[PDB]
Amino acid sequence: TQRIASHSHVKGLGLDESGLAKQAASGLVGQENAREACGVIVELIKSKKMAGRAVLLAGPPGTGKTALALAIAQELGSKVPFCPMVGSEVYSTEIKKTEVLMENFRRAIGLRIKETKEVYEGEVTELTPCETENPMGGYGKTISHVIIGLKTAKGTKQLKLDPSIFESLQKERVEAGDVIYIEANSGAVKRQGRCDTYATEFDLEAEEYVPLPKGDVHKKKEIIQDVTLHDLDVANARPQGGQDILSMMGQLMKPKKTEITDKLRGEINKVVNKYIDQGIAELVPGVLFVDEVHMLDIECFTYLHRALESSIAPIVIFASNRGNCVIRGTEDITSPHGIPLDLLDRVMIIRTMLYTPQEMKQIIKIRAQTEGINISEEALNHLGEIGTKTTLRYSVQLLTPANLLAKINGKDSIEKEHVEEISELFYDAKSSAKILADQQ
Amino acid sequence: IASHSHVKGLGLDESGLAKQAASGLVGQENAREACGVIVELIKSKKMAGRAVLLAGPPGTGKTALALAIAQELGSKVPFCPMVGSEVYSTEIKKTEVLMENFRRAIGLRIKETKEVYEGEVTELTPCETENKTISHVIIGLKTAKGTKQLKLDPSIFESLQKERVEAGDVIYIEANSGAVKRQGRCDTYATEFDLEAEEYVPLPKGDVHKKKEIIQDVTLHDLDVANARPQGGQDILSMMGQLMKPKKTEITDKLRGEINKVVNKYIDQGIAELVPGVLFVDEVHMLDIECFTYLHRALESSIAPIVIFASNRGNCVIRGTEDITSPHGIPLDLLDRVMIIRTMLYTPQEMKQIIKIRAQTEGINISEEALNHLGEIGTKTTLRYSVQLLTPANLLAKINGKDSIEKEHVEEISELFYDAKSSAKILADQQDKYM
Amino acid sequence: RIERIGAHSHIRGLGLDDALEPRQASQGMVGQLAARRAAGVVLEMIREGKIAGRAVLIAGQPGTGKTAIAMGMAQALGPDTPFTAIAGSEIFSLEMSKTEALTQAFRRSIGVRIKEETEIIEGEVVEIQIDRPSKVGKLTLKTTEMETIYDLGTKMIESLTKDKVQAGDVITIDKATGKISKLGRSFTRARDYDAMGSQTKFVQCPDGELQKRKEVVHTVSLHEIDVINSRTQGFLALFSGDTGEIKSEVREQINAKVAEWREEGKAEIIPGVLFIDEVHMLDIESFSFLNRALESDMAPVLIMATNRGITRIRGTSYQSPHGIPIDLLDRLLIVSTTPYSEKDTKQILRIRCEEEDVEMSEDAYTVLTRIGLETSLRYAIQLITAASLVCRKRKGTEVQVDDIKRVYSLFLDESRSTQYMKEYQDA
Amino acid sequence: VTRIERIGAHSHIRGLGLDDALEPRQASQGMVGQLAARRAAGVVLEMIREGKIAGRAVLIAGQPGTGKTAIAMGMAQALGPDTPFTAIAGSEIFSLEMSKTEALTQAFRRSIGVRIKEETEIIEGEVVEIQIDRKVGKLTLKTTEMETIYDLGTKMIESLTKDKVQAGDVITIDKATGKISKLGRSFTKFVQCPDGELQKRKEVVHTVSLHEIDVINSRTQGFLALFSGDTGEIKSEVREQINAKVAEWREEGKAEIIPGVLFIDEVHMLDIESFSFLNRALESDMAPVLIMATNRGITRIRGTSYQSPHGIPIDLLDRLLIVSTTPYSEKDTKQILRIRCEEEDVEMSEDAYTVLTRIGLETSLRYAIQLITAASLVCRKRKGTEVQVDDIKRVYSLFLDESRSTQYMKEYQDA
Amino acid sequence: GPIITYHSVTVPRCSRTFITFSDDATFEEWFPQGRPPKVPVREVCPVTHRPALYRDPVTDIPYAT
Amino acid sequence: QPVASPIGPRSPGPSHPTFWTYTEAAHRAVLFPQQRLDQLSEIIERFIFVMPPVEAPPPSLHACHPPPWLAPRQAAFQEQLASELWPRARPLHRIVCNMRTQFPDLRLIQYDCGKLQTLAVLLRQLKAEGHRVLIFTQMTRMLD
């Protein structure tokens, strides 16, 4: 299901082949200086060369920071990981502030890994030993091979296995006329019960009789995993299973992150390199979108430009909304953009301009197209006009209730009177502020 | 490695007067001859809860005298060096740290006797019986003296099973703790197999059944935390150390009361011997008002040890109050319960001879000219800064091919490195450029 | 292999000579002769490790190479010497106190290397026999020089069956424990050659005597020791989040036992460095503890980078230089870093662009130095890769002045954004 | 030789030196002067021993060091054992594992004892033989006057097989539970055998407080009070029903409650939230008669900028009785110093006593009490026997005081 | 007697694997013995000829409705 | 059971998609606690030496005349708990031993006797050369 969101209209930056932003494309309109600025960092990400780079989307509220910020995830595509987070998610009750930053830093660095494994399936028809002519002294014959016949929907083929496979089979306690599972690369043999096709009657036992496996007896298909560094970190951190009583502590919540860096410089961060150089995994460095960064504490800001200096770190796309504002956690500090001067010195700021009536009108048209509203040309013009007064948010939010009033009034398109009636039932921030100031 | 090793005693004459140059301590003669009375009181084992406040400007030896006090009493009495920042614990109550440190500064030397079973095990036949649990176990240990059979509880057999032991190996058994270790198989069977994963240890000597007295020295906090966080062998209560293992808060009836009663029962029967300690709470000037107010009842206790505080501030706002200030950053109610000891600020000659003493500590051969120039460089700065341009100076001299340190060496090392005062003016000049 | 380059990956160590004389632009370090010489002196003091409990502070203008000098020291120090880099804000944890975090940080830079002389065997498996019924068997190992036959025991047979090695495998047999570590396969294959199986790979067989006495080494940090010794939770020192060490019952015992080991010669010492970046974040209590934490033989040297001037100390209202109280500032001697000049910034940009494998014209260098001297150095360094992308997008070869000038207008460094912040966005 | 308890700051205090009519003597039982406050302490002690009018609070005010804690220690000593006297500092309620109000009500419950009587039968003799027939057997016990056999039942044989007790061990056997305890191996640990009867009925009384009962009736083996593992009991569910069950024990002949005593030292540390709880916790039946002290006057209340006597709000200040202590004179100070010297092994001269009294009236009283032992030890340094004036002067020079150390601050230190 | 010897050999170059039943060659087949393939089929009911889903405990006759 | 863990759950066979989704290489990237034991065995053995200065019995026992149903139920509870977790706590026995008691590490036998160091140096070469030694002592205790 679609479930239309507030940003389900932005499909991309809308840049041409020469890197110049179109006036209106891929849902975005205007902001050419910004959509071209934040387009270079897309190639920066697609290079997988730099680490710890940062770009700051600094502009007034409602200019489109989040609009063209998550649109980069569209241009980059879903293949590369994209970890969004608001500045209020750092404050936690079970994990220190400066640690949520690191945890999110490693969640943005993806690591796709590929493996190929042969597979065997089908009803085992017979397992007869292959004779070895008295390898030791005159005690008895020896199993040099074991002829196994596997039946499948395609065909039945006889195969030889090693004597160790024979021992594994004997200790596995399987019989003939059932379905087994063999993996020659590792050697482990798994069982899938008997063959539901002919082996079981109407009996009740849920032995999980697998139907006659359909397909070739031998099949190979590369498994492509998509694991992040944070996922493997938490895995090595919060083990699973039903043994090793330390792991049996499944009753406790165990939210206990703050992965010690020993486990970073040691495990997965190292086996990642040992798999990449081995030709098994391909690192997929992602993006770390941190909006409302002005909410981070002074400690968080200080740790930010220490983790951003590490060779293992993704790009960062900040979105600062406050102007010259006091840093949270300190006093009598008037750093611009609510970000310390030291950190602003490390980020590349992209200034988004203020939308003109025509650009806001285009945005309203696009949002109406996305929501599926059949807004008329008069209603659109009046919406643009009443949106030039207030912000773009209130202007473009008057499409769903107006459409409801239309449908209720026997209509199929928003008319000039519908948005006028809705404009009186609901008002924006400035109107409510004036009404409050007039009252007590 | 030496950081505060130059101090090895108060360096006092038999008459208590501080020997000007002795024990690697020079200067602060009054403070040292005063700490002499403190150490004499500590060795008396008569008073409890007496507090001392080593007050003075920074780098005046108060901590040096505090460590010399420990060096004077020796390693026999307990000494607990604690900083005022250890009370602000997040996993346990703030006053809990203070009370457990007061309890931890009290020693307890308790001679104990324990038995030991050892030797080469011959066979292990678990006596079977219907309950249908194993009743007992007969184990035969062969030693150089002789071979004897003995019956132990099923718990010891279970422990042996945990060790995965077999018949004919060497084992160590303790009936007090019940822990049975696996030293390895007997040594005579080394020729049996060609190569094995087992270790071979010679047939244990002495009688299979042997005892011995052990003169152990521990503290009362050890018993407190052992009774508050129990432990044992083959008991599932150890689960407490996996899901319920935060820092404990021994209740009053346990920290005091029963532990003191059992310790007195051990003492009055001729098995234990009390030894007071010294609680050196350095940087006390930054404790919380709550800590200062609890110190009232903490010191007035008849069990509390001799405390030796060390303040640095002259007059600042007390932490935790935010509005009232007092001398030393300590409230006056607590300041009345301490015997303040001054610490004189070092003079040029005293500082020069301190530098000299510190130089010969970590194997440094400094010339007289460089030594005297260090005095000039020090009279402009703090002693702790001037006493640290010795190891860099020696390392730089080792590079210049000169075995000793000359004027130019310490002049270039005094130029590469700045100090607090000399670096503060550099920032005051460039005020609106450091941020 | 794939670990993308960072802002400090270009420095491979202090560009010093054998006499601690810093070169102009050697080994990635450009200019900054005085601070580099000071760092070289303190590093020579580090590789000696006969005094512990000292500290050295590197102060200067923002963007002058404090963290750069720290990384250079870390690199020139190399492995086999614990180096811990921590920001001042990292100790503010919720599962442990500040003093506990500081103790852990200190003890994480103190290594204990226990030299263990364990005799083992190393040879190519030629044949293995095992009689299952206890079970008994044999083993034959081959090296390039000699061969022999072994009469395996019950436990050796059990271990080899758990490993389930086969002929041709090159393995190492620990005579003490019996652990079988297989390095790979010799020139042997085809278990049946009719069954399925993965690709085969072979490696040369071991040389020299079959049984030889080699030297293993186990290097762990004092923090890891106190950790695994803190409580009986199995396989600690990773455990994903938790350290609650006790002061006396564990810490003092670890120190005493390490001293005893040093006495007899098991593992003497290897001190490290604790680079505490942005130490101005530490609380007054953190400095109070650091005062006496440095007064210990197990207290490794620490390096602090400060950017603040005359500013109040966090946690109180006391103005002090470097945002550090004069109590802790009494021990550490301070090093001053001079702002980079025109030729220094130009060469820094040159090296940083040659690190990213980007070619910039002679006029590109001049314009970028102009920008990085009117603006901060970090912005001029960030403009090296941003300008290197438009060039590629236009199928260029080397960055020109036009690409840099365009990417300069595309972004704002610190002042072109605050000067334009004249719209009263929010406050 | 040296016990866990030594010569503290309140050892001389052996109790209130009052007559049969609560009239304080000039100096008795280690308490000097302080007539008015000491007799008020006597009145409160008497009405506590009465134990009818519960829920009363008293505040011992006065200048710093005016025996405000000495009066409380004397009251504790006079009340004697078998009556809970809980003493805690105002800072001890600030706990991380439990809320301040919960800690306060916990201390309240701890300050209330419950008297229960038992009629168990305890055996006390020496083992002669133990038998096991794999199971039943027989047991023969011995005392200095008689010997007897015993049939080892299931419980007895099991417990004696689990325990290593064997022949020739003086032991005790509680026939109710069967707990075995050996007090010494044999004749001469070794200890002689007991006397009198082997099996004799023994009355046992336990003064368990409501806190102990609550902790016993909260969880499976809930007796974790030893380390206060509990973070707070369930109010009104496991805490109100225990009160009803105790009232059931009472007025039936099963148990009787013993009103304890609480002494919160330095109450000015308690915040406004703790005072608010006291305003209602002191109005219940099971509420102890507490005492408190504070050396501050009208200071700020922890929590707001309000100024109130003792740093305590007016709502609670009008809810308690104040007991002010007057400053000591030369006579009282000298007598206190003499009693302190008698507590220790020091013996000062008369002129030394006068000098020490002058020194203690100049700066403060506690300073002289502290210098007592310092001068005693300095006398032993010169190989003397009596503490002369010269030793006290040497000490006064060596060890500084609050007022003289503060004035020496003519050199600026950190701040 | 009951000896089952596992023997791995480095033949020529290439590693083979043999498992010999030194006790008796018959045990070479005794272990991989059996091969009882299944041969059931639906037991159509006698009343409506529908595919049987049950078996009356009294009659033992398979029925479906 | 594994919600977002990087390794897959129990795969009953290939017929369900869940098998062809998790690589074994990624499975080796996560170490279970017993695998961490196998990794750390060396340092676990050669660095775990601390012991509690005091070790009191587990229970803070309580004398009483309790009801007859309490002690048997508590005994059954302990029996239930022990029979289940101890088989799973066995792997931690190795560390509990080192944490329980501490014995000489056999390195001091040679270190605390100089003449044994030269003897070690000599026997090493004599065995490398293929010789066989006869060691004579007057003392029998010295043979130990």
Ligand SMILES: Nc1ncnc2c1ncn2[C@@H]1O[C@H](COP(=O)(O)OP(=O)(O)O)[C@@H](O)[C@H]1O
């Ligand atoms: N370039 C754009 N094209 C189309 N719509 C836009 C654009 N920029 C902003 N909007 C609209 O404005 C609304 C609010 O903008 P948003 O990005 O949330 O503000 P900010 O990022 O400044 O907080 C969005 O719901 C979006 O539909």
Ligand SMILES: Nc1ncnc2c1ncn2[C@@H]1O[C@H](COP(=O)(O)OP(=O)(O)O)[C@@H](O)[C@H]1O
């Ligand atoms: N009596 C003394 N003799 C020699 N050196 C001293 C003495 N007192 C202090 N010092 C020197 O001063 C330095 C710091 O002293 P410290 O104990 O820190 O004083 P404070 O506790 O006042 O800071 C030490 O390195 C030591 O060498």
Ligand SMILES: Nc1ncnc2c1ncn2[C@@H]1O[C@H](COP(=O)(O)OP(=O)(O)O)[C@@H](O)[C@H]1O
């Ligand atoms: N000595 C140096 N040699 C080369 N580059 C340097 C040097 N010092 C600083 N830089 C450059 O300056 C940038 C940031 O410097 P930084 O370490 O942040 O200085 P500071 O620690 O004073 O803030 C780095 O990207 C680095 O390339």
Ligand SMILES: Nc1ncnc2c1ncn2[C@@H]1O[C@H](COP(=O)(O)OP(=O)(O)O)[C@@H](O)[C@H]1O
């Ligand atoms: N009535 C008295 N009898 C004997 N000694 C007293 C008496 N009153 C006070 N003292 C002594 O004077 C000192 C006063 O200190 P203290 O009462 O503890 O101060 P505070 O009550 O303010 O905590 C005590 O150490 C005590 O020994």
